[PDB]
Structure formats: structure tokens, C-alpha cells
Amino acid sequence: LSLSTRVTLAFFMSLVAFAIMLGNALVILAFVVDKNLRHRSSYFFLNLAISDFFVGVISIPLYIPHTLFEWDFGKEICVFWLTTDYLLCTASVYNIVLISYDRYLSVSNAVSYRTQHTGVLKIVTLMVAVWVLAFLVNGPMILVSESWKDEGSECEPGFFSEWYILAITSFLEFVIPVILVAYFNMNIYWSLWKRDQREHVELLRARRLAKSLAILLGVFAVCWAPYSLFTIVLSFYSSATGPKSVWYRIAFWLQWFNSFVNPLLYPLCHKRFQKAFLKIFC
Ligand SMILES: NCCc1c[nH]cn1
């Protein structure tokens, strides 16, 4: 490819990485500064922001020279990049699932949710469990499958050669999170709908709630399904390892776009966090 086009692509991808860094940095700054954001939802938002921020800082910036400018990762560097990227992505997915579970509990057991005493230790335990499971899904397999890789230098995970490992990983990182999020969102909507001139206002508010939940679920699914399905299909047809097509690269970038989108949906739509941002920037 021409040097000018490569430079332009590098600039755009660096802009994407900078945006990913900046949104989550703002979220973390709000959490650290306000000190009125010590609720469970705020801690989960902080976890998600940390995950997406370190997606912005490590994964994408390492990606640009490797792909656009032909820098050759070292084997250990490739292992580090793969492990960190998969860990961060799965951690983002699991943080979204945990946020959905928290909102479902707040809407279904509001009395117990309000009266319940939750210490910082339990919230930290939930966050650490999210991270631990995120690692357990991918890393123990990436490190083990590094041996399976051929002599030729390829920085995809080794288990990409086996389609069933891909199927299991996608089941534990995409399918179950999607099902859980859909269940929680549908239950929140059902809660409001059961609770529901006056009828017209109730209909409008129910429509708004449905639209919001559908937007969340659809964004998550649209971002995470393309690449997973592409990888599974290609591995089943043995095309997972080898040259990549343009659509494959777009699907690859969709997950990082999800990492970019998460800050503006879950944190930025919360009134407490909006107040924090307004105070900070004013
Ligand atoms: N979740 C596997 C790593 C990845 C895919 N797309 C972007 N990063």
C-alpha cells in the first residue's frame, strides 16, 4: 500500500485510540475526584472504564506499527499483546454483564437493594472476580496454544487452528453474556411495564425505556458478533489462520469501537456522573 494511505490510516487509528483513552480517563477522573460516586454502579463503571482505557493505551497503539508499518512483534511481545487484549475485552464484556445484573437487582428487589449493606470489600471482590474470569477464559489457552503455532510468524492465537476451542471461548465470552444482558434488560422493561393522558405518558416512557435497553443490547451484539462469527466460520473452514480480508479487519476493529462506545453509554448517561463531569469541566 502507498505510504500516504498508510500514514492516513495510522493517524485515524491513533485518533480512535486517543478517544478511547480520553473518555475512560474522564470517567476515572470523575470517580476519583467527586467522592460522591461510591455506589456499586459507580464502582462497576470504574472497572469498565479501566478496562476500556487500558484497551486504548496498550492494544491499539501496539497494533498500529505491527500492521500499518510492518513492525515485527517479538514472540514474547506478541504473547503479551494477545493476552492483554483478550483479557481487557473479556473484562469489558463481563463488566457490562455485572452492570446489567446490578440494575436488574435494583429494579427487582429495590427494597433489599436500598436497605442492603454492601461494603467496599464485596465490591472489590466482584471486580476482582470479573477480572479473574476474564483472564481464565482466554489467557490459559493463549499461553498453552503458543506452542501449537507454526514456525512462520503469526500473531493470532494458536487455538484459532481448532474451531471447537473458538466455539467454547465465544460461548463463554459472547453467547452467555448476551443472553444474560438480554434477560436482565427484558426483566427491567417488564418491571416498568407491570408498574404501568396518564396512559399516553406511561406508553411514551415505556417506549423510551425499551428504546434505551434495545440500543444497549444491539450495540453490544453488533460490536461483538461479527468478529466472533467470522473467526468461528473461518476456523471451521480452516481459513482462520492466514491472510485476512477487509471485512475481517473491520470486524476486528468493531470490538475496539465497542470499547470506545462504552464510556458514552453507561457512565455518561448517569446523572451522578453527569454532575461530576459538569463540575469538573466548569
Ligand atoms: N477480543 C479479541 C481481540 C480483539 C478483537 N478485535 C479487537 N481486539
Curated annotation (Swiss-Prot):
Protein localization: Cell membrane
Pfam families linked to this entry: 7tm_1
Keyword Isomerase tagged: no
Primary role: The H4 subclass of histamine receptors could mediate the histamine signals in peripheral tissues. Displays a significant level of constitutive activity (spontaneous activity in the absence of agonist).
A cellular-component GO term for this protein: plasma membrane
Gene3D superfamilies: Rhodopsin 7-helix transmembrane proteins
Cysteine disulfide partners in this protein: 78-155
Tissue: Expressed primarily in the bone marrow and eosinophils. Shows preferential distribution in cells of immunological relevance such as T-cells, dendritic cells, monocytes, mast cells, neutrophils. Also expressed in a wide variety of peripheral tissues, including the heart, kidney, liver, lung, pancreas, skeletal muscle, prostate, small intestine, spleen, testis, colon, fetal liver and lymph node.
Induction: Expression is either up-regulated or down-regulated upon activation of the lymphoid tissues and this regulation may depend on the presence of IL10/interleukin-10 or IL13/interleukin-13.
Extracellular side: 65-78, 144-163, 234-249
Organism for this UniProt entry: Homo sapiens (Human)
Subunit structure: Interacts with TSPAN4.
Alphabetical UniProt keywords: Cell membrane, Disulfide bond, G-protein coupled receptor, Glycoprotein, Membrane, Receptor, Transducer, Transmembrane, Transmembrane helix
Family of the protein in this entry: Belongs to the G-protein coupled receptor 1 family.
The name this protein goes by in its record: Histamine H4 receptor
Family annotation (InterPro entries): GPCR_Rhodpsn, GPCR_Rhodpsn_7TM, Histamine_H4_rcpt
SUPFAM superfamilies: Family A G protein-coupled receptor-like (SSF81321)
Domain of life: Eukaryota
Membrane topology: Multi-pass membrane protein
Note from the entry: Does not bind diphenhydramine, loratadine, ranitidine, cimetidine and chlorpheniramine. Shows modest affinity for dimaprit, impromidine, clobenpropit, thioperamide, burimamide clozapine, immepip and imetit. The order of inhibitory activity was imetit > clobenpropit > burimamide > thioperamide. Clobenpropit behaves as a partial agonist, dimaprit and impromidine show some agonist activity while clozapine behaves as a full agonist. Thioperamide shows inverse agonism (enhances cAMP activity).
Segments on the Cytoplasmic side according to the record's topology features: 32-43, 100-122
Major site of localization recorded for this protein: membrane
